[PDB]
Design a binder for this molecule. Sequence first.
Ligand SMILES: Cc1ccc2cc(CC3CCN(C(=O)c4c5ccccc5cc5ccccc45)CC3)ccc2n1
Ligand SMILES: Cc1ccc2cc(CC3CCN(C(=O)c4c5ccccc5cc5ccccc45)CC3)ccc2n1
Lengths: 694, 694
Amino acid sequence: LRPIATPYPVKEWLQPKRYKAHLMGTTYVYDFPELFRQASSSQWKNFSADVKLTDDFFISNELIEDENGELTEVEREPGANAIGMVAFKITVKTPEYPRGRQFVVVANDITFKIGSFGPQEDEFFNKVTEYARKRGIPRIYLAANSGARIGMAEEIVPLFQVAWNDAANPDKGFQYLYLTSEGMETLKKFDKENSVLTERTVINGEERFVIKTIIGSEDGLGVECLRGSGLIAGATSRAYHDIFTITLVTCRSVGIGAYLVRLGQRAIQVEGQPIILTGASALNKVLGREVYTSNLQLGGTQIMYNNGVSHLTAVDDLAGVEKIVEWMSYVPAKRNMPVPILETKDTWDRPVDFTPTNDETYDVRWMIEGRETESGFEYGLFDKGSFFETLSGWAKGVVVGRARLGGIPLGVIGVETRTVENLIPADPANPNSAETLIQQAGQVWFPNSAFKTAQAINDFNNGEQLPMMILANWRGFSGGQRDMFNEVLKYGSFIVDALVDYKQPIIIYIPPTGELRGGSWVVVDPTINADQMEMYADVNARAGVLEPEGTVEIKFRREKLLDTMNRLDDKYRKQLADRERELLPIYGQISLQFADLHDRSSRMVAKGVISKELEWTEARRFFFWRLRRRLNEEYLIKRLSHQVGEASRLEKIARIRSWYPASVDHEDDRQVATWIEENYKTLDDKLKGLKLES
Amino acid sequence: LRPIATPYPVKEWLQPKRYKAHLMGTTYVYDFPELFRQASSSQWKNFSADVKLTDDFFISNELIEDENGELTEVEREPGANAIGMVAFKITVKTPEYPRGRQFVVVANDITFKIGSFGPQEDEFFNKVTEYARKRGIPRIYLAANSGARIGMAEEIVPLFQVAWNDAANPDKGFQYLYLTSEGMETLKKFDKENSVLTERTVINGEERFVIKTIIGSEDGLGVECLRGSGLIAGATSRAYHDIFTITLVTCRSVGIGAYLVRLGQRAIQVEGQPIILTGASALNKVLGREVYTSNLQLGGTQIMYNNGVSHLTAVDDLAGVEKIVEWMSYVPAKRNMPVPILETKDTWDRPVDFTPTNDETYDVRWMIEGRETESGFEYGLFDKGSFFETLSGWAKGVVVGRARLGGIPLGVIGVETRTVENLIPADPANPNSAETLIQQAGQVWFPNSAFKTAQAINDFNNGEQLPMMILANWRGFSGGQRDMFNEVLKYGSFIVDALVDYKQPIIIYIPPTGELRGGSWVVVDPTINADQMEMYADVNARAGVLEPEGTVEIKFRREKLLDTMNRLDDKYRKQLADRERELLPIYGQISLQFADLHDRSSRMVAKGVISKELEWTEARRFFFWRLRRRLNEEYLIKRLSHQVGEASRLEKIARIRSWYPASVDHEDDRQVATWIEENYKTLDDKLKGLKLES
Ligand SMILES: Cc1ccc2cc(CC3CCN(C(=O)c4c5ccccc5cc5ccccc45)CC3)ccc2n1
Ligand SMILES: Cc1ccc2cc(CC3CCN(C(=O)c4c5ccccc5cc5ccccc45)CC3)ccc2n1
C-alpha cells in the first residue's frame, strides 16, 4: 500500500490495473463512465445552473456476453474482465432528452495484454456494434490499443531442433527445423498434438519430425487476429451509415485501432496520443536508417488534426468526453427519431445583428454565431453559443460545425474569406525535402476544402441525420495546374454525391456580400436533390457563370465597347484613337456595371433558380419557420410512405397538402407548422384510416 | 465547292458543319455512329476473321424529343439539330451479344454555339440519361464542349444610358445606368418588357428609368445554365450507380463538361484534348501575371491520365471509340442481366505457365495475361489477350483491368512488385517550386494506390456489375510521416467501403511468392462482406500480423535467443560473450525461420481464415469452376429473393442447396454448376410453385 494515511481508500491499490492505466497516460477503462457522469452534469450546469440533479439522471451498466454469447447487463467489480474489450450501456437524462437517452461505450482495456486485439475482443466489439445498430442507439468507441495481438507457438520454442549442415561449425548453415520423438510426445502429453504439422524422415539412424508449419495451441497469434480486425473494420464501415459513431483516442491507437478511428469517421484525439500504423522504430528498421524520432511524428495531432482524420483535439480524457457529450447534444436519441429541439435564451424571434460589409474583412464564424464588441454582443444567424465547429484543424477555407436555429439542430457549412495558410512538413525520409507553406485564396475551392465539404455533408447525413445549411460563397474551383494535378475534379464530384445521398432538409443560401460562380454553383444546385434541396440568395449576393470581369472579356469586347462610345460620347461621334485612350477606363467600368446588373438575386428569382430572395437581418426568422415547416412536412411524408407503399414524393406531398384546410396558405411556413403541430393526432387518425389496403 | 473534281461528293461541303468540326480537331457529331460501326466490325474481325458481316449487324437511330418532350427515333439529315446536344440509340450484334445489345450515345455538337450547355441541351442530356437508366442500357457520353452557355441581354446593349457625375468630363465617374421613355417603348414594342427591372425617377426634367436588374429576353445567359448544369451533374452521379457510364473527351471539355467526365467515372481522353475548369488565359488575368501557357498544361493527358481522372488515352477519336467498344465487351447488355460469357481459343482446361520466382523480378501482368518468350507463349491465369488494363497512367503500384477466365468476364487487381516513380510537376504559379520525383516501394499501399484500389472496386461494381479477383500481395500501408499526413488512412478506409458495397462474387488470392501483412490483410478480409467474399492463399504465399523480422523483434528477443543457444549449442551450455558473438548471426536466421513457419497457408487453412490453400499452376481450373458455380448459385439466390420476400442469405442458399440431389457434393463446383445448368427450367418450376404466398 502506497501511499499510507490517505483520508479515503487508495483506488490505484484496490485495483492495481487503475495504476497501470495511469502510468500509460490514460484513464482506467472502468473510470470512463464517471467521466461521462461528470460531463453530463456539466451539460446541465451550462444549460440551467439552477437544476437540482440527482444520481438517477445517469446510469451506466456494463455489458458482457452471457453463456450463449448474448450481451447482458452486469454489476461487478472493475478489472474482472476476462477479455481486453469492455462495454457499457449508458442511460442519461440530458437537456435535449430530459426523460433519458441511450448509447453504448466500447473501449479497449490498455491493461489487458497491452490493449491488443485478439479474436475475442474482435468478436465482442462486433457484438456491441450490432447491439447498438439493432437498437439504433449511438456507438462511442474509446481507443487505447496496441493493434492486432501478435504471438508465437511458445510451446515449440523449447522443443524445436535444428538440422545443421555441419554440427561442429554452426555458422556453416542449417537445412530445416525438427522435433524428436521426445518433442512429439511432450506435445501429445499436453494435448498440443495440433501445434505443429510434421513430416517424418530418418537421418543417420535418428527419426526426425520435420516442422513444415507451426500452428500453435494458443488462439490469437496471427492471421485469426487479422480476420477479426477485418470483421470489426467492416462492422464499423456499416455502423457509420446506420448509427451515430464517434471515437476518442486516449493513449495510442495502432493498426486496426487507427482504421477503426477513421471508419467511425467522427474522431477526437487527445494531445500526445498517436494514431499510427507501423511505429517509428519498426519503420527505421525497415528503412535501415534512423529516419523517425517518435510515433507522434507519424500520428500525433500535428498530423491527424491537420489531416482531418481527427475532427477535434482534447487537452485530456475528460475534455474529450465533454466534446463527445456536446457533439451528441445535436444528434437524435436513436436512428430515425426526430432531431433534438433545444430552445435556449436566444429565441428565433429577433433580427441578425452581425452583417458583413464589402470594404471590411470578417470572420464567417461571426455571421454564424455572432461576435462580442465593446458596444455589446452582435447576434449572428444561429443561437448564441450553439456553434460547435468540427474538422477545425484541416482545410480551414471551409468552416464546418453544428448549430441551433431557435432550438433546431443542424449542420452548418460556411466559407472562410481570409487567405488560408497550411504548413506541409518536410519528409524525414527525403534528405532533399523542405517544409512548404501553401497559401490558398479565400472563396476558392481547393482539393482539401472540397474534400472537407463532401465529408461534412456525409457526416451530417449518416448517423447525425441532421438538416443542413450551406452559406454558399465560392468564386469557383482552383483550375490551376497544381490543383488540377491534385485531382480537384474528384473532390468536387464527391460534393455532388454527398448531396444526392442527403435524406434531411437542405438550405443553400448565398449570403450578403456573397457570390456563387461557375463550377461552385453546379456542385451545390438544388436539382442535384430536388426532394431535399432549396436555394436562396440574399439581395446583396451575386451569381453568374463568370464574374463581371470575365463576362466583359468574353461578351462586351473592344468593338462592342467602341460602338457604345459612338452611341454615348458626343465627342467620339486619326483624331479618335486619342478620345478612345481617354474614355476606355470609364467605359471599362460601365461594361463591368452592365454585366454586374445580370448577377442580381432579382434575375435568380425571375429565372426560377432560387426559392426566394432574402434580407440577411430577416433570415433567422425566415429560416426558423421554413425548417420547422419542412421538418413537419418530412415527418408526414414518412408516415405516408408506410401507408400507400408506392407513390412519388410529389404524390405524397400533394396528398398531405390536400389535408390542410382551404384557408391555410401552403406558402406560409409558420401557419403550416402551427396547423400540423395542432393536428398530429388528428393526422394520425387520417393515416390510420388509409390502412384500407389490398 | 472546294475541292472540285473529286470521285464522290464532298461531304464537308454538303454539310459545312462537318468542316467546322474538323477545323476544331474533332469528328463531326453525326459521323460518330459510323466510328461505332467501324469499331464493332473490327471487334468481329479480331474475334473470328471468317465472319461474314452485313449492315443489319449495326443500327444507329437518332433520338429527338417529340411535341410532348418524349424521346423518339428519327431518320433525318445530319445538322438539322435545333439544340447543341445529340443522341443515338445503337443496336449492335457483337461477339458477346450476337443477337444484339443496346446503348445510347449522347454528344455535344461542337458546331452548335461552340458546344456550350444551354438549358435545352441540359434538359435533353438529362432526358437521355433517364431513358438509358429506365432501360438499364449503357450511356456513352462524347464530350466536345465550351461548358455552360454565357450571355448578356444584347437588346439592352444599344438602349442603356449612363447618369454621369459631370457630362463634360466622363472620367469624373457615373452614378447608375438607365433607360429613356424611348428605350422603354423600344422594349415594349418587341414584347421585351420583362428584359429589365426599372425604377422611375425625374432628374432635372428628364424622366429616367433606373436599371436595377438586367434579366434579358434570350434564355440561357447565366444562372439558368448553372441550374441546368447542376441537374445534369446530379443525373450523372445517379446514372454511375445504375448503368454503365463511359465518356470520350474529343475536343476540349470545359466546366460542367469536366465534371461530367468525372461524374460518369469511366473516361478515355484523346491526346491533345484538354479537360479544364477555368482556362489558362482567364487564370492569367486573375493572377495578374503570365503564369500558364496553354489549356493542355491545366487539363491535358499529362494531368488527367496521370491523375486517374482519365482511365485511358486515345491517339484519335476512332481509337477512343474502339476502346469504349472493347471496354463494353466485358459488361452486361443491360442492368441485372448476367455478365457476358465469351469463350475464345484459350479454354479453361490448361495449367498456368508463367510462375513467379523469389530470386527474379517479374511484371504482374505476366501472371495475369502471360508473356511471350523465345521458347513460346507462357500462358497466365487469365484468357490470352483478354487483359484490358484501365487507370494505367495513375498510381502504377496497383494494376487494374478487366479479363476473362475461360470466358467469364471479371475485374482484376494485381500488385506491381517493381518500385514505381511519379513525376510531380513544378507549379507554374510558384517561383520557388521545382518538379519532384517520388519513389514508391513495391507491395506497399500508398495514398494514391489505395485510392486506385477503392476506385477500381467501385468501378467494377457499379454499372459493370462484374465479379472480382484481387491477387493480394501487399506488405502493408506506408506508415511514414509524409504518407500519414497525406491521409493514407482515408484511402485505405475507402477500400473497406467499396468491398462492403460489392454485389457480385469476390475472390481474394495471395499468389505464389506473395504476402499479405498487418493493415493490408485487415482491409481486404472476407468478413468485410461474407456474402460475396472468399479468400485463398497459394502454398507459396505468406501472411501474418508482421513479417518474420518484426515477429522476431517483438516475440523472439535477446533473452529467448540466448536460452535457445543454451539449449542447442553444446559449447554455450566472461568466456560466453565470445560464443554469443559467433552464434548470433545464425541464431538470428533460426529465429527468422521459426517465425516464417507460422506464416504458411497451412496455418491459414487450420485457423479457418482462407477457404482453401491452392497451387498456382492449378488456379485457372479451380477459379473457373468456382466462379461458374458461384455465378449459378447467385442467380438462384436472386430468384429466391423475389419469392419468399423475407429471409437471410444463409436461409436462401441452404434452401437452394436442399434442392440439389443427395448425390451432389455441395463442395464440387463443377458438379454443382453442371447440375444447375442442366436444370434451370426445372428449378424455374420449383420457384414458380413457391408462389403459394400470403
Ligand atoms: C488560384 C485561384 C485564385 C482565384 C481563383 C478564382 C476563380 C474564380 C473565377 C476566375 C475567373 N472567372 C472570371 O470571371 C474571370 C475573371 C475574374 C476576375 C478577374 C479577371 C477575370 C478574367 C476572366 C477572363 C475570362 C473569363 C473569366 C474571367 C470566373 C471566376 C477561379 C480560380 C481561382 N484560382
Ligand atoms: C516506405 C515503406 C517501405 C516499406 C514498408 C513496408 C511495410 C511493411 C511492414 C514493415 C514492418 N513490419 C515488420 O514485420 C518489421 C520489419 C520488417 C522488415 C524489416 C525490419 C522490420 C522490423 C520490424 C520491427 C518491429 C516490428 C515490425 C518490423 C511489418 C511489415 C510498411 C511500411 C513501409 N513503408
